[PDB]
Amino acid sequence: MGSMERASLIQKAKLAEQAERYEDMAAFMKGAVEKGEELSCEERNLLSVAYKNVVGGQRAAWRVLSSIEQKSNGPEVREYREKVETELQGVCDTVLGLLDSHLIKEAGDAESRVFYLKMKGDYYRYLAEVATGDDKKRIIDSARSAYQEAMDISKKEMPPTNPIRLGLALNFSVFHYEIANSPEEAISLAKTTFDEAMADLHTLSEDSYKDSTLIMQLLRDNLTLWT
Amino acid sequence: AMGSMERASLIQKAKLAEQAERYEDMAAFMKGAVEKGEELSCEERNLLSVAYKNVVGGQRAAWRVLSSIEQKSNEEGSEEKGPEVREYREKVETELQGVCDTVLGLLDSHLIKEAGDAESRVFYLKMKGDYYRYLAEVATGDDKKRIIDSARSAYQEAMDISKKEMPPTNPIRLGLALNFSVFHYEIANSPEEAISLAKTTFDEAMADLHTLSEDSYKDSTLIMQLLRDNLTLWT
Amino acid sequence: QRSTSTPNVH
Amino acid sequence: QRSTSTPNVH
Ligand SMILES: [Cl-]
Ligand SMILES: [Cl-]
Ligand SMILES: [Cl-]
Ligand SMILES: [Cl-]
Ligand SMILES: [Mg+2]
Ligand SMILES: [Mg+2]
Ligand SMILES: [Mg+2]
Ligand SMILES: [Mg+2]
Ligand SMILES: [Mg+2]
Ligand SMILES: [Mg+2]
Ligand SMILES: [Mg+2]
Ligand SMILES: [Mg+2]
Ligand SMILES: [Mg+2]
Numbered sequence A: 001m002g003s004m005e006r007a008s009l010i011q012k013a014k015l016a017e018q019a020e021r022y023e024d025m026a027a028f029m030k031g032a033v034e035k036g037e038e039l040s041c042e043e044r045n046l047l048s049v050a051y052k053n054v055v056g057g058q059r060a061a062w063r064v065l066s067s068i069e070q071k072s073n074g075p076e077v078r079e080y081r082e083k084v085e086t087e088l089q090g091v092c093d094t095v096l097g098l099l100d101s102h103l104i105k106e107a108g109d110a111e112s113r114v115f116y117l118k119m120k121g122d123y124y125r126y127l128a129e130v131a132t133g134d135d136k137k138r139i140i141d142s143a144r145s146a147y148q149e150a151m152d153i154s155k156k157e158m159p160p161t162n163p164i165r166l167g168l169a170l171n172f173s174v175f176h177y178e179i180a181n182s183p184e185e186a187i188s189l190a191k192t193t194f195d196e197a198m199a200d201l202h203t204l205s206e207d208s209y210k211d212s213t214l215i216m217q218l219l220r221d222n223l224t225l226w227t
Numbered sequence B: 001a002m003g004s005m006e007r008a009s010l011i012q013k014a015k016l017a018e019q020a021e022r023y024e025d026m027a028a029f030m031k032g033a034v035e036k037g038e039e040l041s042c043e044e045r046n047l048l049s050v051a052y053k054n055v056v057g058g059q060r061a062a063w064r065v066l067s068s069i070e071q072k073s074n075e076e077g078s079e080e081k082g083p084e085v086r087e088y089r090e091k092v093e094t095e096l097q098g099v100c101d102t103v104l105g106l107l108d109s110h111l112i113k114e115a116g117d118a119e120s121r122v123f124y125l126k127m128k129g130d131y132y133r134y135l136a137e138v139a140t141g142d143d144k145k146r147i148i149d150s151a152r153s154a155y156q157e158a159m160d161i162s163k164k165e166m167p168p169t170n171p172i173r174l175g176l177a178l179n180f181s182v183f184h185y186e187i188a189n190s191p192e193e194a195i196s197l198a199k200t201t202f203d204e205a206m207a208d209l210h211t212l213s214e215d216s217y218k219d220s221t222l223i224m225q226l227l228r229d230n231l232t233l234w235t
Numbered sequence C, D: 001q002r003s004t005s006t007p008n009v010h
Helices: A006-018 A022-033 A041-072 A076-106 A110-130 A133-157 A163-179 A183-199 A206-226 B007-019 B023-034 B042-076 B083-114 B118-138 B141-165 B171-187 B191-207 B214-234
Strands: none
Touching: A006 A022, A006 A041, A006 B042, A006 B083, A022 A041, A022 A076, A041 A076, A041 A110, A041 B007, A076 A110, A076 B007, A110 A133, A110 A163, A133 A163, A163 A183, A163 A206, A183 A206, B007 B023, B007 B042, B023 B042, B023 B083, B042 B083, B042 B118, B083 B118, B118 B141, B118 B171, B141 B171, B171 B191, B171 B214, B191 B214
Protein backbone atom coordinates (compact mmCIF):
# COMPACT_ATOMS: atom_id res chain seq x y z
CA MET A 1 0.00 0.00 0.00
CA GLY A 2 2.98 2.31 0.62
CA SER A 3 3.59 2.61 -3.14
CA MET A 4 0.03 3.69 -3.96
CA GLU A 5 -1.04 7.32 -3.74
CA ARG A 6 -3.52 8.18 -1.00
CA ALA A 7 -6.20 9.15 -3.53
CA SER A 8 -5.82 5.75 -5.22
CA LEU A 9 -6.08 3.91 -1.89
CA ILE A 10 -9.32 5.74 -1.10
CA GLN A 11 -10.71 5.03 -4.57
CA LYS A 12 -9.86 1.35 -4.23
CA ALA A 13 -11.44 1.20 -0.77
CA LYS A 14 -14.65 2.50 -2.36
CA LEU A 15 -14.39 -0.08 -5.17
CA ALA A 16 -13.81 -2.87 -2.64
CA GLU A 17 -16.90 -1.70 -0.74
CA GLN A 18 -19.00 -1.89 -3.92
CA ALA A 19 -17.60 -5.38 -4.55
CA GLU A 20 -18.27 -6.51 -0.95
CA ARG A 21 -14.56 -7.26 -0.57
CA TYR A 22 -14.20 -6.03 3.00
CA GLU A 23 -10.79 -7.52 3.79
CA ASP A 24 -9.41 -5.67 0.77
CA MET A 25 -11.34 -2.54 1.76
CA ALA A 26 -9.81 -2.61 5.24
CA ALA A 27 -6.30 -3.08 3.85
CA PHE A 28 -6.75 -0.11 1.50
CA MET A 29 -8.00 2.04 4.38
CA LYS A 30 -5.07 0.97 6.56
CA GLY A 31 -2.76 2.08 3.76
CA ALA A 32 -4.60 5.39 3.52
CA VAL A 33 -4.36 5.96 7.27
CA GLU A 34 -0.62 5.28 7.09
CA LYS A 35 -0.20 8.28 4.76
CA GLY A 36 -0.49 10.34 7.96
CA GLU A 37 -3.33 12.69 6.98
CA GLU A 38 -6.49 12.97 9.06
CA LEU A 39 -9.52 11.11 7.75
CA SER A 40 -12.68 12.89 6.65
CA CYS A 41 -16.11 11.76 7.87
CA GLU A 42 -16.59 9.79 4.66
CA GLU A 43 -13.21 8.13 5.15
CA ARG A 44 -13.89 7.28 8.79
CA ASN A 45 -17.05 5.57 7.54
CA LEU A 46 -15.00 3.58 5.02
CA LEU A 47 -12.54 2.55 7.75
CA SER A 48 -15.30 1.60 10.18
CA VAL A 49 -17.43 -0.35 7.68
CA ALA A 50 -14.42 -2.30 6.40
CA TYR A 51 -13.01 -3.48 9.72
CA LYS A 52 -16.42 -4.07 11.31
CA ASN A 53 -17.36 -6.38 8.42
CA VAL A 54 -14.12 -8.33 8.83
CA VAL A 55 -14.31 -8.68 12.60
CA GLY A 56 -18.08 -9.18 12.44
CA GLY A 57 -17.56 -12.28 10.29
CA GLN A 58 -14.93 -13.58 12.70
CA ARG A 59 -17.11 -12.91 15.76
CA ALA A 60 -20.03 -14.76 14.16
CA ALA A 61 -17.77 -17.72 13.34
CA TRP A 62 -16.25 -17.73 16.82
CA ARG A 63 -19.70 -17.77 18.40
CA VAL A 64 -20.78 -20.75 16.28
CA LEU A 65 -17.64 -22.70 17.15
CA SER A 66 -17.68 -21.77 20.85
CA SER A 67 -21.28 -23.01 21.04
CA ILE A 68 -20.38 -26.33 19.41
CA GLU A 69 -17.37 -26.61 21.73
CA GLN A 70 -19.46 -26.03 24.86
CA LYS A 71 -22.19 -28.44 23.72
CA SER A 72 -19.52 -31.06 22.98
CA ASN A 73 -17.93 -30.65 26.42
CA GLY A 74 -12.16 -34.96 19.93
CA PRO A 75 -9.72 -31.97 19.82
CA GLU A 76 -10.89 -30.56 16.47
CA VAL A 77 -13.51 -28.02 17.57
CA ARG A 78 -11.19 -26.58 20.22
CA GLU A 79 -8.32 -26.37 17.72
CA TYR A 80 -10.45 -24.69 15.07
CA ARG A 81 -12.11 -22.31 17.53
CA GLU A 82 -8.57 -21.34 18.63
CA LYS A 83 -7.55 -20.76 15.01
CA VAL A 84 -10.47 -18.40 14.37
CA GLU A 85 -9.92 -16.72 17.75
CA THR A 86 -6.27 -15.99 16.90
CA GLU A 87 -7.28 -14.47 13.57
CA LEU A 88 -9.91 -12.30 15.28
CA GLN A 89 -7.37 -11.11 17.86
CA GLY A 90 -5.00 -10.27 15.01
CA VAL A 91 -7.54 -8.00 13.32
CA CYS A 92 -8.44 -6.31 16.61
CA ASP A 93 -4.74 -5.74 17.31
CA THR A 94 -4.30 -4.23 13.83
CA VAL A 95 -7.17 -1.81 14.42
CA LEU A 96 -5.98 -0.89 17.91
CA GLY A 97 -2.50 -0.37 16.47
CA LEU A 98 -3.80 2.06 13.84
CA LEU A 99 -5.77 3.91 16.50
CA ASP A 100 -2.75 4.22 18.80
CA SER A 101 -0.11 4.95 16.14
CA HIS A 102 -2.03 7.28 13.82
CA LEU A 103 -5.66 8.13 14.52
CA ILE A 104 -6.22 9.13 18.16
CA LYS A 105 -3.19 11.39 18.57
CA GLU A 106 -3.66 13.10 15.17
CA ALA A 107 -7.40 13.87 15.52
CA GLY A 108 -8.12 17.60 15.83
CA ASP A 109 -11.83 18.05 16.53
CA ALA A 110 -14.01 16.52 19.25
CA GLU A 111 -16.16 14.48 16.86
CA SER A 112 -13.23 12.57 15.40
CA ARG A 113 -11.51 12.19 18.80
CA VAL A 114 -14.69 10.67 20.26
CA PHE A 115 -15.21 8.43 17.23
CA TYR A 116 -11.70 6.97 17.52
CA LEU A 117 -11.96 6.45 21.28
CA LYS A 118 -15.30 4.72 20.74
CA MET A 119 -13.62 2.51 18.15
CA LYS A 120 -10.84 1.71 20.63
CA GLY A 121 -13.48 0.73 23.18
CA ASP A 122 -15.27 -1.44 20.62
CA TYR A 123 -12.18 -3.40 19.54
CA TYR A 124 -11.07 -3.96 23.13
CA ARG A 125 -14.64 -5.15 23.75
CA TYR A 126 -14.33 -7.64 20.89
CA LEU A 127 -11.07 -8.87 22.43
CA ALA A 128 -12.88 -9.15 25.78
CA GLU A 129 -15.56 -11.40 24.24
CA VAL A 130 -12.95 -14.12 23.64
CA ALA A 131 -10.59 -13.44 26.56
CA THR A 132 -10.21 -15.48 29.76
CA GLY A 133 -8.54 -15.00 33.14
CA ASP A 134 -6.26 -12.08 34.03
CA ASP A 135 -5.84 -11.00 30.41
CA LYS A 136 -9.61 -10.51 30.34
CA LYS A 137 -9.50 -8.13 33.32
CA ARG A 138 -6.88 -5.89 31.69
CA ILE A 139 -8.73 -5.90 28.35
CA ILE A 140 -12.05 -5.02 30.00
CA ASP A 141 -10.35 -2.14 31.83
CA SER A 142 -8.87 -0.89 28.54
CA ALA A 143 -12.31 -0.94 26.90
CA ARG A 144 -13.88 0.83 29.87
CA SER A 145 -11.16 3.50 29.90
CA ALA A 146 -11.50 4.25 26.18
CA TYR A 147 -15.28 4.43 26.37
CA GLN A 148 -15.21 6.62 29.48
CA GLU A 149 -12.79 9.11 27.93
CA ALA A 150 -14.99 9.25 24.84
CA MET A 151 -18.07 9.77 27.03
CA ASP A 152 -16.38 12.58 28.96
CA ILE A 153 -15.41 14.45 25.78
CA SER A 154 -18.77 13.89 24.11
CA LYS A 155 -20.68 15.29 27.10
CA LYS A 156 -18.54 18.44 27.11
CA GLU A 157 -18.29 19.01 23.38
CA MET A 158 -21.14 17.41 21.46
CA PRO A 159 -24.96 17.72 21.45
CA PRO A 160 -26.90 14.83 23.09
CA THR A 161 -28.42 13.79 19.77
CA ASN A 162 -25.13 13.72 17.84
CA PRO A 163 -24.90 10.29 16.09
CA ILE A 164 -21.34 9.66 17.30
CA ARG A 165 -22.32 10.50 20.88
CA LEU A 166 -25.36 8.23 20.55
CA GLY A 167 -23.47 5.35 18.96
CA LEU A 168 -20.84 5.58 21.68
CA ALA A 169 -23.44 5.54 24.46
CA LEU A 170 -25.25 2.60 22.84
CA ASN A 171 -21.99 0.63 22.61
CA PHE A 172 -20.91 1.55 26.14
CA SER A 173 -24.30 0.34 27.39
CA VAL A 174 -23.74 -2.96 25.58
CA PHE A 175 -20.31 -3.17 27.21
CA HIS A 176 -21.92 -2.70 30.63
CA TYR A 177 -24.56 -5.35 30.01
CA GLU A 178 -22.65 -8.03 28.11
CA ILE A 179 -19.04 -7.62 29.29
CA ALA A 180 -18.93 -5.86 32.66
CA ASN A 181 -21.91 -7.68 34.24
CA SER A 182 -23.40 -4.29 35.08
CA PRO A 183 -27.08 -4.42 33.96
CA GLU A 184 -28.10 -1.57 36.26
CA GLU A 185 -25.52 0.72 34.68
CA ALA A 186 -26.37 -0.48 31.16
CA ILE A 187 -30.07 0.28 31.65
CA SER A 188 -29.46 3.58 33.42
CA LEU A 189 -27.03 4.74 30.72
CA ALA A 190 -29.36 3.70 27.90
CA LYS A 191 -32.42 5.34 29.47
CA THR A 192 -30.58 8.58 30.33
CA THR A 193 -29.09 8.68 26.82
CA PHE A 194 -32.47 8.09 25.18
CA ASP A 195 -34.24 10.74 27.24
CA GLU A 196 -31.55 13.39 26.85
CA ALA A 197 -31.32 12.73 23.10
CA MET A 198 -35.09 12.98 22.65
CA ALA A 199 -35.12 16.22 24.66
CA ASP A 200 -32.70 17.82 22.19
CA LEU A 201 -33.86 16.11 18.98
CA HIS A 202 -35.54 19.31 17.77
CA THR A 203 -32.08 20.90 17.46
CA LEU A 204 -30.51 18.06 15.43
CA SER A 205 -29.48 18.78 11.84
CA GLU A 206 -31.47 16.93 9.19
CA ASP A 207 -28.23 15.36 7.90
CA SER A 208 -28.01 13.28 11.10
CA TYR A 209 -31.72 12.64 11.72
CA LYS A 210 -31.88 9.17 10.14
CA ASP A 211 -28.78 7.90 11.93
CA SER A 212 -29.65 9.37 15.34
CA THR A 213 -33.23 8.06 15.23
CA LEU A 214 -31.91 4.60 14.36
CA ILE A 215 -29.57 4.58 17.36
CA MET A 216 -32.36 5.84 19.63
CA GLN A 217 -34.54 2.95 18.38
CA LEU A 218 -31.76 0.50 19.27
CA LEU A 219 -31.49 2.01 22.76
CA ARG A 220 -35.26 1.49 23.12
CA ASP A 221 -35.01 -2.09 21.84
CA ASN A 222 -32.15 -2.94 24.20
CA LEU A 223 -34.10 -1.38 27.07
CA THR A 224 -37.09 -3.59 26.23
CA LEU A 225 -34.82 -6.65 26.11
CA TRP A 226 -33.09 -5.78 29.38
CA THR A 227 -36.19 -4.97 31.46
CA ALA B 1 0.56 -28.67 8.06
CA MET B 2 -2.23 -30.70 6.45
CA GLY B 3 -0.25 -33.62 4.99
CA SER B 4 0.17 -35.18 8.44
CA MET B 5 -3.37 -34.43 9.66
CA GLU B 6 -5.88 -37.21 10.19
CA ARG B 7 -8.25 -37.35 7.23
CA ALA B 8 -11.18 -37.67 9.64
CA SER B 9 -10.08 -34.49 11.42
CA LEU B 10 -9.88 -32.57 8.14
CA ILE B 11 -13.42 -33.66 7.27
CA GLN B 12 -14.70 -32.72 10.74
CA LYS B 13 -13.06 -29.30 10.45
CA ALA B 14 -14.54 -28.79 6.98
CA LYS B 15 -17.98 -29.41 8.54
CA LEU B 16 -17.24 -26.97 11.38
CA ALA B 17 -16.04 -24.34 8.90
CA GLU B 18 -19.29 -24.81 6.95
CA GLN B 19 -21.37 -24.23 10.10
CA ALA B 20 -19.26 -21.12 10.78
CA GLU B 21 -19.63 -19.85 7.18
CA ARG B 22 -15.84 -19.92 6.85
CA TYR B 23 -15.71 -21.14 3.27
CA GLU B 24 -12.06 -20.42 2.51
CA ASP B 25 -11.11 -22.53 5.54
CA MET B 26 -13.65 -25.18 4.52
CA ALA B 27 -12.10 -25.39 1.06
CA ALA B 28 -8.59 -25.69 2.47
CA PHE B 29 -9.65 -28.52 4.79
CA MET B 30 -11.26 -30.35 1.87
CA LYS B 31 -8.15 -29.83 -0.27
CA GLY B 32 -6.17 -31.44 2.53
CA ALA B 33 -8.65 -34.33 2.69
CA VAL B 34 -8.46 -34.85 -1.08
CA GLU B 35 -4.66 -34.92 -0.85
CA LYS B 36 -4.87 -37.99 1.42
CA GLY B 37 -5.46 -39.85 -1.85
CA GLU B 38 -8.64 -41.73 -0.87
CA GLU B 39 -11.91 -41.56 -2.79
CA LEU B 40 -14.54 -39.12 -1.55
CA SER B 41 -17.99 -40.01 -0.27
CA CYS B 42 -21.14 -38.22 -1.41
CA GLU B 43 -21.08 -36.04 1.68
CA GLU B 44 -17.45 -35.17 0.99
CA ARG B 45 -18.12 -34.25 -2.64
CA ASN B 46 -20.84 -31.93 -1.31
CA LEU B 47 -18.39 -30.37 1.16
CA LEU B 48 -15.75 -29.94 -1.56
CA SER B 49 -18.23 -28.43 -4.02
CA VAL B 50 -19.98 -26.11 -1.54
CA ALA B 51 -16.67 -24.81 -0.18
CA TYR B 52 -15.01 -23.95 -3.47
CA LYS B 53 -18.21 -22.69 -5.10
CA ASN B 54 -18.71 -20.26 -2.20
CA VAL B 55 -15.16 -18.97 -2.59
CA VAL B 56 -15.21 -18.66 -6.37
CA GLY B 57 -18.84 -17.46 -6.31
CA GLY B 58 -17.80 -14.51 -4.15
CA GLN B 59 -14.86 -13.76 -6.44
CA ARG B 60 -17.04 -14.01 -9.57
CA ALA B 61 -19.60 -11.62 -8.07
CA ALA B 62 -16.85 -9.16 -7.15
CA TRP B 63 -15.21 -9.46 -10.57
CA ARG B 64 -18.53 -8.75 -12.28
CA VAL B 65 -19.08 -5.61 -10.20
CA LEU B 66 -15.58 -4.35 -10.96
CA SER B 67 -15.68 -5.25 -14.66
CA SER B 68 -18.93 -3.30 -14.97
CA ILE B 69 -17.47 -0.24 -13.24
CA GLU B 70 -14.34 -0.55 -15.38
CA GLN B 71 -16.29 -0.66 -18.64
CA LYS B 72 -18.63 2.17 -17.61
CA SER B 73 -15.60 4.28 -16.70
CA ASN B 74 -13.83 3.55 -19.99
CA GLU B 75 -17.00 4.30 -21.99
CA GLU B 76 -17.36 7.67 -20.29
CA GLY B 77 -13.79 8.12 -21.50
CA SER B 78 -12.74 10.82 -19.03
CA GLU B 79 -9.09 11.87 -19.33
CA GLU B 80 -8.61 11.15 -15.60
CA LYS B 81 -10.41 7.91 -14.58
CA GLY B 82 -10.01 4.12 -14.97
CA PRO B 83 -6.51 2.92 -13.81
CA GLU B 84 -7.46 2.05 -10.24
CA VAL B 85 -10.53 0.01 -11.14
CA ARG B 86 -8.55 -1.84 -13.83
CA GLU B 87 -5.81 -2.67 -11.32
CA TYR B 88 -8.25 -3.83 -8.67
CA ARG B 89 -10.29 -5.85 -11.17
CA GLU B 90 -6.99 -7.49 -12.19
CA LYS B 91 -6.21 -8.25 -8.52
CA VAL B 92 -9.55 -9.99 -7.97
CA GLU B 93 -9.21 -11.76 -11.32
CA THR B 94 -5.79 -13.15 -10.36
CA GLU B 95 -7.19 -14.46 -7.07
CA LEU B 96 -10.13 -16.07 -8.88
CA GLN B 97 -7.82 -17.72 -11.41
CA GLY B 98 -5.73 -19.06 -8.51
CA VAL B 99 -8.71 -20.76 -6.87
CA CYS B 100 -9.89 -22.23 -10.18
CA ASP B 101 -6.37 -23.54 -10.84
CA THR B 102 -6.34 -25.13 -7.37
CA VAL B 103 -9.63 -26.91 -8.04
CA LEU B 104 -8.57 -28.06 -11.50
CA GLY B 105 -5.31 -29.28 -9.96
CA LEU B 106 -7.16 -31.40 -7.40
CA LEU B 107 -9.39 -32.82 -10.12
CA ASP B 108 -6.46 -33.69 -12.38
CA SER B 109 -4.03 -34.93 -9.72
CA HIS B 110 -6.43 -36.88 -7.49
CA LEU B 111 -10.14 -37.00 -8.18
CA ILE B 112 -10.91 -37.85 -11.82
CA LYS B 113 -8.45 -40.71 -12.28
CA GLU B 114 -9.16 -42.25 -8.85
CA ALA B 115 -12.99 -42.25 -9.09
CA GLY B 116 -14.25 -45.83 -8.85
CA ASP B 117 -17.74 -45.36 -10.33
CA ALA B 118 -19.45 -43.58 -13.24
CA GLU B 119 -21.51 -41.26 -11.06
CA SER B 120 -18.53 -39.78 -9.25
CA ARG B 121 -16.46 -39.65 -12.46
CA VAL B 122 -19.22 -37.62 -14.13
CA PHE B 123 -19.45 -35.31 -11.12
CA TYR B 124 -15.72 -34.58 -11.28
CA LEU B 125 -15.70 -34.03 -15.06
CA LYS B 126 -18.66 -31.68 -14.64
CA MET B 127 -16.68 -29.84 -11.98
CA LYS B 128 -13.70 -29.60 -14.36
CA GLY B 129 -16.03 -28.13 -16.99
CA ASP B 130 -17.43 -25.66 -14.47
CA TYR B 131 -14.06 -24.36 -13.27
CA TYR B 132 -12.74 -24.00 -16.82
CA ARG B 133 -15.98 -22.12 -17.52
CA TYR B 134 -15.28 -19.77 -14.62
CA LEU B 135 -11.79 -19.23 -16.03
CA ALA B 136 -13.34 -18.58 -19.46
CA GLU B 137 -15.54 -15.81 -18.02
CA VAL B 138 -12.45 -13.71 -17.24
CA ALA B 139 -10.18 -14.88 -20.07
CA THR B 140 -9.37 -12.81 -23.16
CA GLY B 141 -7.99 -13.52 -26.64
CA ASP B 142 -6.31 -16.81 -27.56
CA ASP B 143 -6.10 -18.00 -23.95
CA LYS B 144 -9.89 -17.74 -23.90
CA LYS B 145 -10.20 -20.03 -26.93
CA ARG B 146 -8.07 -22.76 -25.32
CA ILE B 147 -9.92 -22.50 -22.00
CA ILE B 148 -13.31 -22.69 -23.72
CA ASP B 149 -12.14 -25.81 -25.57
CA SER B 150 -11.00 -27.35 -22.27
CA ALA B 151 -14.40 -26.68 -20.69
CA ARG B 152 -16.21 -28.10 -23.72
CA SER B 153 -14.06 -31.25 -23.68
CA ALA B 154 -14.66 -31.92 -19.98
CA TYR B 155 -18.40 -31.35 -20.30
CA GLN B 156 -18.64 -33.51 -23.45
CA GLU B 157 -16.83 -36.43 -21.78
CA ALA B 158 -19.11 -36.10 -18.77
CA MET B 159 -22.18 -36.01 -21.02
CA ASP B 160 -21.04 -39.10 -22.94
CA ILE B 161 -20.56 -41.13 -19.76
CA SER B 162 -23.76 -39.87 -18.14
CA LYS B 163 -25.89 -40.89 -21.13
CA LYS B 164 -24.44 -44.41 -21.06
CA GLU B 165 -24.34 -44.93 -17.31
CA MET B 166 -26.88 -42.79 -15.47
CA PRO B 167 -30.68 -42.29 -15.49
CA PRO B 168 -31.93 -39.03 -17.13
CA THR B 169 -33.32 -37.89 -13.76
CA ASN B 170 -30.07 -38.41 -11.83
CA PRO B 171 -29.21 -35.05 -10.12
CA ILE B 172 -25.58 -35.16 -11.27
CA ARG B 173 -26.63 -35.84 -14.85
CA LEU B 174 -29.21 -33.04 -14.65
CA GLY B 175 -26.84 -30.55 -13.05
CA LEU B 176 -24.22 -31.35 -15.70
CA ALA B 177 -26.69 -30.81 -18.54
CA LEU B 178 -27.92 -27.55 -17.00
CA ASN B 179 -24.36 -26.25 -16.65
CA PHE B 180 -23.33 -27.39 -20.14
CA SER B 181 -26.36 -25.58 -21.54
CA VAL B 182 -25.26 -22.43 -19.72
CA PHE B 183 -21.78 -22.92 -21.19
CA HIS B 184 -23.29 -23.09 -24.68
CA TYR B 185 -25.36 -19.96 -24.20
CA GLU B 186 -23.09 -17.67 -22.17
CA ILE B 187 -19.57 -18.79 -23.14
CA ALA B 188 -19.64 -20.50 -26.53
CA ASN B 189 -22.22 -18.14 -28.08
CA SER B 190 -24.22 -21.18 -29.19
CA PRO B 191 -27.87 -20.43 -28.24
CA GLU B 192 -29.24 -23.11 -30.58
CA GLU B 193 -27.18 -25.80 -28.85
CA ALA B 194 -28.00 -24.38 -25.41
CA ILE B 195 -31.74 -24.46 -26.10
CA SER B 196 -31.63 -27.87 -27.77
CA LEU B 197 -29.68 -29.41 -24.90
CA ALA B 198 -31.89 -27.81 -22.23
CA LYS B 199 -35.11 -28.84 -24.00
CA THR B 200 -33.94 -32.42 -24.61
CA THR B 201 -32.74 -32.72 -21.01
CA PHE B 202 -35.99 -31.33 -19.61
CA ASP B 203 -38.18 -33.57 -21.78
CA GLU B 204 -36.21 -36.77 -21.14
CA ALA B 205 -36.19 -36.08 -17.39
CA MET B 206 -39.93 -35.34 -17.34
CA ALA B 207 -40.57 -38.57 -19.29
CA ASP B 208 -38.98 -40.62 -16.50
CA LEU B 209 -40.00 -38.45 -13.53
CA HIS B 210 -42.67 -40.97 -12.48
CA THR B 211 -39.87 -43.44 -11.67
CA LEU B 212 -37.81 -41.03 -9.52
CA SER B 213 -36.78 -42.24 -6.06
CA GLU B 214 -38.18 -39.95 -3.36
CA ASP B 215 -34.62 -39.29 -2.16
CA SER B 216 -33.76 -37.41 -5.37
CA TYR B 217 -37.18 -35.96 -6.22
CA LYS B 218 -36.63 -32.52 -4.69
CA ASP B 219 -33.20 -32.01 -6.28
CA SER B 220 -34.14 -33.31 -9.73
CA THR B 221 -37.33 -31.24 -9.92
CA LEU B 222 -35.38 -28.14 -8.88
CA ILE B 223 -32.88 -28.60 -11.72
CA MET B 224 -35.72 -29.25 -14.17
CA GLN B 225 -37.29 -25.95 -13.07
CA LEU B 226 -34.02 -24.12 -13.74
CA LEU B 227 -33.86 -25.69 -17.22
CA ARG B 228 -37.40 -24.38 -17.79
CA ASP B 229 -36.48 -20.92 -16.49
CA ASN B 230 -33.43 -20.73 -18.75
CA LEU B 231 -35.54 -21.89 -21.69
CA THR B 232 -38.05 -19.10 -20.98
CA LEU B 233 -35.21 -16.56 -20.77
CA TRP B 234 -33.57 -17.81 -23.97
CA THR B 235 -36.80 -17.82 -26.00
CA GLN C 1 -30.62 -11.53 -16.44
CA ARG C 2 -27.83 -14.13 -16.61
CA SER C 3 -28.61 -17.81 -17.18
CA THR C 4 -28.97 -19.85 -13.99
CA SER C 5 -26.53 -22.69 -13.35
CA THR C 6 -26.74 -25.54 -10.82
CA PRO C 7 -27.23 -23.95 -7.36
CA ASN C 8 -24.60 -24.21 -4.65
CA VAL C 9 -26.63 -26.43 -2.34
CA HIS C 10 -26.10 -30.01 -1.18
CA GLN D 1 -30.86 -12.84 22.47
CA ARG D 2 -27.81 -10.59 22.28
CA SER D 3 -27.85 -6.85 22.89
CA THR D 4 -27.68 -4.75 19.72
CA SER D 5 -24.69 -2.47 19.16
CA THR D 6 -24.21 0.32 16.65
CA PRO D 7 -24.93 -1.18 13.20
CA ASN D 8 -22.32 -1.41 10.51
CA VAL D 9 -24.07 0.97 8.15
CA HIS D 10 -23.67 4.53 6.90
CL1 LIG E 1 -7.62 -25.77 12.95
CL1 LIG F 1 -13.24 15.38 28.72
CL1 LIG G 1 -5.20 -3.30 -6.45
CL1 LIG H 1 -19.53 -41.65 -26.52
MG1 LIG I 1 -0.20 10.19 -1.51
MG1 LIG J 1 -5.36 10.28 -8.90
MG1 LIG K 1 1.33 13.02 1.98
MG1 LIG L 1 -6.69 -18.33 22.50
MG1 LIG M 1 -6.40 20.35 13.38
MG1 LIG N 1 -5.63 -40.13 7.73
MG1 LIG O 1 -15.38 14.02 -16.49
MG1 LIG P 1 -5.32 -10.99 -15.80
MG1 LIG Q 1 -13.52 -48.13 -5.61
